[PDB]
Ligand binder design. Structure first.
Ligand SMILES: NS(=O)(=O)c1cc2c(cc1Cl)N[C@H]([C@H]1C[C@H]3C=C[C@@H]1C3)NS2(=O)=O
Ligand SMILES: NS(=O)(=O)c1cc2c(cc1Cl)N[C@H]([C@H]1C[C@H]3C=C[C@@H]1C3)NS2(=O)=O
Ligand SMILES: N[C@@H](CCC(=O)O)C(=O)O
Ligand SMILES: N[C@@H](CCC(=O)O)C(=O)O
Lengths: 260, 262
């Protein structure tokens, strides 16, 4: 009767606690999605086990093999019962798994090292001194691959062939590359993650320009799962009680690392 | 059996659905224009159905009578089988999700405050702590329900005031709330969704303003009767339109490209 929850190590959604090496089970983890999982499970009346996605990916389909990886794959192949993570609701994913109504909003955004002479996606597209890229196997990369918008398509044509690769395996790696590249790398990532990082030491990154799109994260289940309806009602209840706002404010709490 | 014209319930709410110039000699869907008229056409094209737009009889979004338990508005038209789909600025809410289905959201919004320019109010907390400036909400919608149900002290305080205020602070249509702000010399502020607030802020005579942050975060969805076979296709259409940038293009068309305040 224990529900297997797939999730991903992505700050501040799920993180290893201090001294996690002597902790066990769900108690190893903390973050927005850890708290959200506990609330959803309490409303729906299930016990659950948090498991970190084996390949560390969000989820994409191989164009050749047509196999899904990441958390999406874990749902598709029956390795998990639900995904509670910053997993973007997208058309291609909705074809193969189910999603609750969104629990958090986001859009694609630009992270620069402070002082970089870039204010917009158009700015990035019109120059070549500053490299830029995205996370592999997620919705941001797919956004650029599929876009017919001139600026974004121009960006895709550059990124897909850039050498060395501009794509990164994890968000943390993209952020580190921004920080270490003396302004010669900018990173395309979701506004949620960008805003979290902007408020943390060493306070050397910034979000610039407006978001490139508008969407949300949802709780995902395998297609047709019996859990979907109750999970969706739980998201709506927690939204209306103000609990999703409370969790956002807790995990994006500003302690004054950067200025004050 | 054979394909049948889909009955779309919607609501006369600018800029979502508006009477076209020359509507008096036009018929059918041609009578109307706006964001939801354009959206209905896109959804119908993707889903492969023909449709008839029909303005909700009672002019309401939809609420359940606590005594009779009967649903009114667009929600009621779906619940009682009078319409096949609602394409409107209909907020996705818990109590509605219990009785009808919703697509993923096609537009985001939150509850917000509209003031007459110069009114000395910056926030809901400001409103809650004074009595000179009256304030209220639309009837039979999700904003009123938000206040009625809130356990948050500031919003509970606001509800306690609004529910007993005399004369009534509630309005039957958004237009009536706008008029009350505009005519009340700063002595009425209106609680309404950020989408509608931002639209009115760009309409003549450019005398209103949104103040403060939004009080919540939610969205509008396309609604169908519970279990309707149309829901899956409509949902995928919303996602496709979102990802193609078409929803953003439509919002800019109806809010900003046509703005009258500069
Ligand atoms: N401010 S936020 O992104 O934490 C945030 C974002 C969102 C919230 C709640 C919060 Cl707190 N709830 C809404 C939900 C309420 C109902 C209407 C839309 C979904 C279903 N989703 S959202 O609009 O994606
Ligand atoms: N900027 S906006 O409100 O017009 C707006 C708002 C939204 C859009 C698209 C636009 Cl253009 N799409 C998203 C949709 C994309 C997928 C993720 C959440 C739903 C399904 N809904 S939203 O986040 O409510
Ligand atoms: N939230 C994204 C991952 C991050 C990104 O692609 O920027 C997804 O669900 O794929
Ligand atoms: N969108 C709201 C109506 C507007 C409001 O309540 O402010 C609803 O679906 O009830």
């Amino acid at each position: 009767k224990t529900v297997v929850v797939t999730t991903i190590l992505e700050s501040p959604y799920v993180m290893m606690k201090k001294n996690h090496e002597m902790l066990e089970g769900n108690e190893r983890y903390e973050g927005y999605c850890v708290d959200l999982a506990a609330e959803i499970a309490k409303h729906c009346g299930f016990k659950y086990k948090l498991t970190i996605v084996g390949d560390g990916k969000y989820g994409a389909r191989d164009a050749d093999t047509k196999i899904w990886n990441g958390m999406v794959g874990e749902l598709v192949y029956g390795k998990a019962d639900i995904a509670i993570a910053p997993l973007t609701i997208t058309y291609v994913r909705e074809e193969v798994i189910d999603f609750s109504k969104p629990f958090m909003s986001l859009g694609i955004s630009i992270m620069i090292k402070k002082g970089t002479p870039i204010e917009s996606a158009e700015d990035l597209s019109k120059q070549t001194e500053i490299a830029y890229g995205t996370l592999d196997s997620g919705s941001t990369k797919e956004f650029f691959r599929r876009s017919k918008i001139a600026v974004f398509d121009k960006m895709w044509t550059y990124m897909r062939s850039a050498e060395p690769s501009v794509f990164v395996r994890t968000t943390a790696e993209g952020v580190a590359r921004v920080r270490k590249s003396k302004g010669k790398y900018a990173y395309l990532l979701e506004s949620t993650m960008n805003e979290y990082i902007e408020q943390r030491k060493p306070c050397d990154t910034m979000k610039v320009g407006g978001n490139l799109d508008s969407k949300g994260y949802g709780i995902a289940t395998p297609k047709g799962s019996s859990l979907g309806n109750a999970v969706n009602l739980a998201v709506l209840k927690l939204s209306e009680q103000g609990l999703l706002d409370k969790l956002k404010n807790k995990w994006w709490y500003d302690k004054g690392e950067c200025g004050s």
